[PDB]
Amino acid sequence: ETLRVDPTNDRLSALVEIYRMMRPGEPPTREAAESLFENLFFSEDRYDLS
């Protein structure tokens, strides 16, 4: 049901959609969205569980 709710379809479009959620108005670019999604979770610098 949720997968029939969402407008977003694929990977680069998903990164664009998250990248538009986090900061509005910024240019949706492939590498900037990739770096944003990496820096949110999958890196030691800004996501540290103990």
Binding site: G25, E26, P27, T29, E31, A32
Partner: protein
């Protein structure tokens, strides 16, 4: 070929002197070098009292071609606030008569002619050398060949003519 055009960039209050140089090193580093056009910042000189005033306080004029790589190159410079355009995601380029007027307002620093060697007769000027040092007087004729100004200094309410030099008088 894309036309490298001017854009206006916000910065902090007094950090923008280093921002242009650091931007030049980012351009040298990231190998986007065939796209940019020797950015600058306008300054001028005003007359210890004299100073060198920045022409626009806290704004930088930058040559761009405006692809998104250029956007994220400029925004990845450590003291850069966002572009100043008509809208977000697309900054408006500055017009052509304004860039002609801003390159024209840096073309007034050209002297020599006419410092002292071209001088007119009949002008009340001052004299700073000899016994007539710091006194006003009306020049009568200008001898360019003999290099002797015939200046009648107004002393005691009376014109006293004397042969002087261009460096021995003050043009007032």
């Amino acid at each position: 070929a894309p036309k490298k055009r001017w854009y206006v960039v916000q910065a902090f209050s007094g950090f923008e002197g280093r921002v242009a140089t650091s931007l030049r090193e980012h351009i040298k580093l990231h190998n986007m070098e065939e796209l940019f056009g020797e950015v600058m910042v306008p300054t001028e000189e005003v007359v210890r009292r004299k100073s060198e005033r920045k022409f626009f306080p806290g704004y930088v004029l930058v040559q761009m071609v405006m692809n998104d790589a250029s956007w994220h190159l400029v925004r990845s410079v450590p003291r850069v606030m966002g572009f100043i355009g008509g809208t977000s995601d697309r900054p408006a380029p500055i017009s052509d008569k304004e860039v002609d007027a801003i390159m024209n307002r840096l073309q007034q620093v050209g002297d020599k002619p006419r410092p002292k060697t071209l001088f007119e007769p009949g002008e009340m000027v001052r004299v700073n050398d000899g016994p007539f040092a710091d006194f006003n007087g009306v020049v009568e004729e200008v001898d360019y060949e003999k290099s002797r100004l015939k200046v009648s200094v107004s002393i005691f309410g009376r014109a006293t003519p004397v042969e002087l030099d261009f460096s021995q008088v003050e043009k007032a």
